[PDB]
Amino acid sequence: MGLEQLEAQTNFTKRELQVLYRGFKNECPSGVVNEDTFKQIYAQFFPHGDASTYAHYLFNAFDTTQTGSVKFEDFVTALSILLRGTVHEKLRWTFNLYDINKDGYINKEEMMDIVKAIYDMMDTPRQHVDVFFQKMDKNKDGIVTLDEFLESCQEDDNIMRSLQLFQNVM
């Protein structure tokens, strides 16, 4: 907790960090987000759709510290990486989210869990993983690594165009 301190370790300005904290605290008033809180947030964004499973994968992406529940400090740095951070940080974060078991690699069924997790929270019947792996895997052994993911996203200029769109808050 520190407005001047976070201004250094993030890319957001003093004015943005205030808006982001207000936006954060309004969802968990000194409660510090847990899995349930995430579910309630994305349920509000997506009506008639169960967001339980995705909230679980999203919560597992956090927690580097102690209490399990992710604090604002870790909430905002993750958001700093996603909105302002370099391309090898945004993709690195996305890759970290796709790797559920947290063991360096993304597999067919692992990816299938996440595609199902988004489809459930809200034309190919969940098997859009087949299109994903065919144009992301260099080895073609059913495993996409970090280095494999980073270089494969560079080749599709359409992703880089959307990922570097620059999204201001406030």
Partner 1 sequence: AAWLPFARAAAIGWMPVANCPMPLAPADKNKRQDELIVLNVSGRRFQTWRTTLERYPDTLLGSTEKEFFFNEDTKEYFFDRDPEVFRCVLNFYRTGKLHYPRYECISAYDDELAFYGILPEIIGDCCYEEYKDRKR
**Which residue ranges make up the site for partner 1 (CB under 8 A)?**
1-3, 17-25, 27, 29-31, 41-42, 45-46, 54, 57-58, 78-79, 82-83, 90-91, 93-94, 97-98, 111, 114-115, 117-118, 121-123, 128-129, 131-132, 136, 149, 153, 156, 158-159, 161-163, 165, 167-170
CA-to-CA separations, 145 to 6, 119, 151, 154, in angstroms, rounded: 32, 24, 10, 15
Cα–Cα distance between 35 and 45 in angstroms, integer? Answer: 16
Identify what 139 binds: Ca ion, partner 1, none; CB under 5 to 8 Å per kind. Answer: Ca ion
For residue 167, give the DSSP letter.
Answer: -
Q: Structure tokens of 83?
A: 């909105």
CA 25 to chain centre: 19
Report the first-to-last Cα separation within the chain, whole angstroms: 20
63's contact among partner 1, Ca ion, none, with CB below 5 to 8 A by partner kind, is none
Specify the residue, 69 or 94, whose C-beta has the smaller distance to Ca ion.
Answer: 94
Q: Which residues bind Ca ion (CB under 5 A)?
A: 101, 103, 105, 139, 143
| Residue numbers belonging to the annotated binding site for Ca(2+) | 99, 101, 103, 105, 110, 137, 139, 141, 148
